[PDB]
Design a binder for this molecule. Structure first.
Ligand SMILES: Nc1ncnc2c1ncn2[C@@H]1O[C@H](COP(=O)(O)OP(=O)(O)OP(O)(O)=S)[C@@H](O)[C@H]1O
Ligand SMILES: Nc1ncnc2c1ncn2[C@@H]1O[C@H](COP(=O)(O)OP(=O)(O)OP(O)(O)=S)[C@@H](O)[C@H]1O
Ligand SMILES: Nc1ncnc2c1ncn2[C@@H]1O[C@H](COP(=O)(O)OP(=O)(O)OP(O)(O)=S)[C@@H](O)[C@H]1O
Ligand SMILES: Nc1ncnc2c1ncn2[C@@H]1O[C@H](COP(=O)(O)OP(=O)(O)OP(O)(O)=S)[C@@H](O)[C@H]1O
Ligand SMILES: Nc1ncnc2c1ncn2[C@@H]1O[C@H](COP(=O)(O)OP(=O)(O)OP(O)(O)=S)[C@@H](O)[C@H]1O
Ligand SMILES: Nc1ncnc2c1ncn2[C@@H]1O[C@H](COP(=O)(O)OP(=O)(O)OP(O)(O)=S)[C@@H](O)[C@H]1O
Lengths: 252, 252, 252, 252, 252, 252
């Protein structure tokens, strides 16, 4: 249902204390971090330690959904609202009512939805596409981005008004390279995960761990996870030394 | 429905007297000011103290709406007007009839709509897109921009003719840094707002207030508001001294 | 429908006599003048005192229309002519047939349309975009610019051939600062306009008038008009002395 | 369809004899001359006294067409050739097949098209943009410029190879100031033109004619034509003496 | 049912050892390689040497299926789900249950399906289009692309999260030009194939083989295969020397 | 397809012997000479007497192609490589594979392409723009310039490394003025050409020939060719004496 946040680094302790400070509030949470730094983890964990903890967790991938369809997707539509609407459909908002609405890649939202979103957050009311019935919405907002929304705001591609209404309680996730002391504990977490799912088994010696620590980790913790998966096939039930690492990961 | 305008500074008193001078007139109001300086506040307040006060308030975000769709959005369209127009739809103008039409980010209007808008303001007539039925429009115009329309006019990006028809009664909103004497009263307003919505509670001591007063406030009053929100979570039901401020806001 | 041209200055008398000389001819009229000097006024007045006086007046704003769409906008298009042409549409030319076509900001026309325009004026024939049906056009041409077409022609940005076919009968509108003796009569005209529309009422004393006369009037007569509008709100049904002027307009 | 070339000057007689020498040949004609010196006149006249005389006359304005679109415009394109090519279209070349292709402002051709043009002239073959079907082209070339192609060639802005393939038979049009003896006969031609089109009527006395003869005529014969048009409105059905000339044209 | 992988090159031996390492695991396999390099071969071979070896092999061509229909095609639909859904239909996923799902041209997947796919891979649950019944899915994932997914990820056209969940065990197929030592053995394989299907017979001499070895092979091994087919018709039951090669393939 | 090289001068005999020495080699040929001295003639003749003689001849005009587009033009591009690349396109190199690539105006190549070109010549490999697929290239290089590449190299505008890789076998074409003994034979060649194409007929007497011999010929042999073309129109089927020459060409 959720994951804990593993690590001993100052920053990850800070993230945990921050998470606790805000979870049971209904305040808007914006999580920033590079891809695969733990942002969704933080989000679902926030939800199951919140007032929405017995409600729905409803993700929206703002970048993945085509701009022309994003409106219907968030707000639902009436039958005949647009071409291909032989249905009347509840939106992500409607489904998220009483639970959490998790706005991922919020920087990839089109300006048109950024404004529509803010009126929904401010008024707490919405209409399905093609409708004039105003409807009630009770969602806790959580958002995440890997983009620099501040520069976007200067570029004129992200709304400043929306920025401050979403950024009440920012949480910053450090990239893996800036917390290489966490790698061993994260590796224990990932291996243990794999062993419980019956996906295999490995373990790393100390040499191979400090080699991993000089890695730059462009995919951060998700890329660490990937590596655990590949080694489990390449050296099944084996011990991973420098030699068992792919050459890309050996740093000596 | 509306907010009052808090503050004791010369400028904010001047804005209030100006607001009263013009509210119950149907004259075009242009409000200039940096993001989050109170421009919408001024606008809705003007509306509910105007002849449109029992009519509709209909916002248009000129920058948010894609240029190709702005025409339909203001003037409505007939069925088949363009690809995807399986509907006939009333425009923002049509919905604003008898009430107020609030033109926000008016500098972000495309030149093509700037001309079309002016013929509507001058003739007081319009057609839906794809139609030849001329229709009647009775709206009070209110516009707002954070841009320098004068320089835009020299750059050739804003229409001079439209500028003078919109700028009958300019109202200038001072940025927060130029009225730091208002911060305490605005803080009382924002806290009181939060306490009434049951979003929490804080209060600021004098040290922390004058620290806030040396802040530059790039997001102005909306950024002040944001800070009240974050402190309410970081120090719930607490008193905010210099130490309780984020370091970015401590100036001693 | 039209406005008369107010004033006693030599130049404005000259403009009136010139207007009469040419109105009932079908000759091409080019009106030059700074923004807000009366150029459209001259144009519609010419039309309603011409052979087109019972026909259509069809404005084109050459600068306002995006260059990629200007062709269709003047000449119309067939269905499928370009992407988004699910329609077949009559152009500005087609709508102007038998009436007047008023070419405003003609210096802002792209060179590509300058040539296409001239073949239309010379051949008196055109095709809709995407079509090969040649069509007949009977329009009286009136054009206006605030730009220096002669320098444009040397810069290579305005076509010389088009210049002479349009500039058969030039009419020059003096800027307001060069005819400050007209200000009082224009003020009477503008006030009387406002009083008839029920937009309010003022009047200017002699001190305030000669203060206005030392003004430079960058927006010329349209800017004069704007001021009458603002004073009507600032001093409703009042008399405007030097003191009632905004400081920008006091010159003593 | 065409115009004759009026005048008694040595040069204009020379142009006529030259025109006859080359008309019924298929040789490349380059006509040089200042704006409005009769270059198009020479061109269409050449065409209707040529082997293409029952074929198409197809003008291309090399300066007017945007460089990015000039290729498609001359050679046509396939569907999908470039963004916005939902059409397959025949080029100016394809339309000119069997008739004349008149290359006006040939000095304003971009170097990229100068090379492409020459391979077409040499190979006598072309492809539509986005296509690999080679197509046949039978056009007689006529070109005109007011620019100094020789200096352009030294500047590196005009192709030398293209220069010699186009300049087989140069025809030079004298500017009006260098043939002021022609003015009277040209004035008879222009007036007679105007009288036949029912655009009005004037005539010039001898004083006014020799005043015109000391004029420098920057717009040459097209500017002469313009003047006949303005006088027809200023003194309808009148006789034009020195006094009836605009002051700019009085030279005594 | 499957094909073996012919060749003696280091890389092809490496591919075989890699294939064995991972076949009987249920790990996600991503095969990269240019068109016709053996990627499907690797895939079906993996399947019939896997835990799915008695289950279904279910190909999806992500590029071939229209984006609007890809969702239904993978997940199935309910009756009335969309216009034309008079049927209820099992998806590719549903049909692949217990067997292998082979995701070919995975880079040609639309971002909208990339996200939907990942939730299916992570949750291991799905709904038919128009349905709210969650369903179970047990498939082994195999994917293939000729595109550079890493650059796609920077271009923002391929999801990074999906990349790492699919790229657990990458297998790279060398293009034919980089393993020209394999050509002879592959030719023996292809000829033997043809002879068994009774499609004809040839054989290559040594001269013609080393001519083939200097070929660049844009279509790689599938293009090699094509050539064997054409020679079998051009020189039935013949020996193929340099002279019997098409000129495009002679390199001496 | 090609032309022979006419003339009896030492230099032209030397060029012929040089041409034979190198044609059937794959060595890089650099041809230097003033505009219109026979450099392309030498090039195509080299090609049709080479190992590429049944392959493609693919000209590139380094000066004519805009610097920003030269890269794509030589190397091709992938779809989306740059703005306006809705296509994937083969480059001049790709089209020249197995045949000749003729680099004309090689001194007009930008330094950026000079380096990229050399890596292609040295590695014999390339990528389309926006791609990471390395591709094979088999072209014979022929280059031509009228510029002084040595001085360019000192000016720092031409790469020295590229100079020596291109200048393996230099061939120098003498300007026409330095071989005036060839004029008669070249005139026979050009007339005979014209007579075969049915473009007319002339012939020169001895007086007119030696007048031509004192000419300086800035356009060299192409300018000679031009003159034959003009005389064919000015004196159709005539004999050209000193008197029939244009005055510019009479030297007595
Ligand atoms: N501190 C952590 N402790 C344990 N597992 C972690 C931690 N951080 C990340 N992970 C795991 O590493 C992976 C990271 O996944 P996510 O948190 O979903 O990435 P993300 O930051 O949300 O990336 P996006 O797509 O840009 S929002 C998952 O497998 C997590 O379970
Ligand atoms: N004088 C004021 N008194 C009380 N509240 C204020 C005052 N000025 C601003 N606010 C509040 O501060 C925030 C400012 O919001 P807006 O007035 O809507 O900003 P804006 O100036 O319209 O910015 P934009 O997007 O560029 S038009 C809102 O929460 C207002 O309620
Ligand atoms: N001589 C005049 N008498 C009366 N009203 C005038 C006179 N000149 C201008 N106006 C008024 O002043 C304003 C000037 O408007 P226009 O004539 O439309 O300006 P314009 O010169 O056409 O400017 P553009 O946009 O560059 S073409 C209008 O309100 C006119 O009614
Ligand atoms: N010799 C002439 N006899 C009679 N009419 C003439 C003569 N020369 C020019 N004209 C007229 O004067 C005008 C000159 O027009 P064009 O010949 O088209 O000018 P142009 O030289 O082609 O200029 P461009 O745009 O630089 S190519 C036209 O009205 C002609 O009909
Ligand atoms: N190593 C090999 N040994 C034997 N046959 C091979 C080998 N590699 C390829 N082939 C054959 O060559 C052809 C290549 O086909 P595929 O493997 O299906 O190509 P592909 O790489 O999957 O291309 P796509 O469409 O981009 S996924 C088939 O006829 C295979 O049987
Ligand atoms: N020796 C020759 N014998 C016969 N014809 C020749 C000879 N030299 C030149 N020509 C002809 O004269 C003209 C010269 O053309 P090119 O050889 O193409 O000139 P070029 O030297 O390549 O000039 P550029 O543009 O600077 S590379 C063509 O018509 C040739 O056919």
């Amino acid at each position: 249902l959720f994951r804990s946040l593993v690590g001993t680094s100052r920053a990850i302790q800070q993230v945990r204390q921050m998470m606790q400070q805000v979870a049971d509030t209904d305040a808007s949470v914006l999580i920033l971090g590079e891809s695969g730094t733990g942002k969704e983890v933080v989000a679902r964990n926030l939800h199951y330690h919140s007032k929405r903890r017995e409600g729905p967790f409803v993700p929206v991938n703002c970048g993945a959904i085509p701009a022309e369809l994003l409106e219907s997707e968030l707000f639902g539509h009436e039958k005949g609202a647009f071409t291909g609407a032989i249905t009347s459909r509840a939106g992500r908002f409607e489904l998220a009512n009483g639970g959490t609405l998790f706005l991922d890649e919020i920087g990839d939202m089109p300006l048109p939805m950024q404004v529509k979103l803010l009126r929904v957050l401010q008024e707490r009311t919405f209409e399905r596409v093609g409708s004039n019935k105003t409807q009630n919405v009770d969602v806790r907002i959580i958002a995440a981005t890997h983009k620099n929304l501040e520069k976007m705001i200067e570029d004129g591609t992200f709304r400043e008004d929306l920025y401050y209404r979403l950024n009440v309680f920012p949480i910053e996730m450090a990239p893996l390279r800036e917390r290489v002391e966490d790698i061993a504990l994260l590796l224990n977490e990932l291996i243990s995960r794999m062993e419980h799912e019956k996906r295999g088994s490995i373990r790393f010696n100390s040499a191979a761990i400090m080699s991993l620590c000089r890695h730059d980790w462009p995919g951060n913790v998700r890329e660490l996870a990937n590596l655990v998966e590949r080694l489990a096939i390449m050296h099944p039930y084996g011990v991973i030394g420098v030699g068992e690492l792919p050459k890309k990961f050996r740093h000596v």
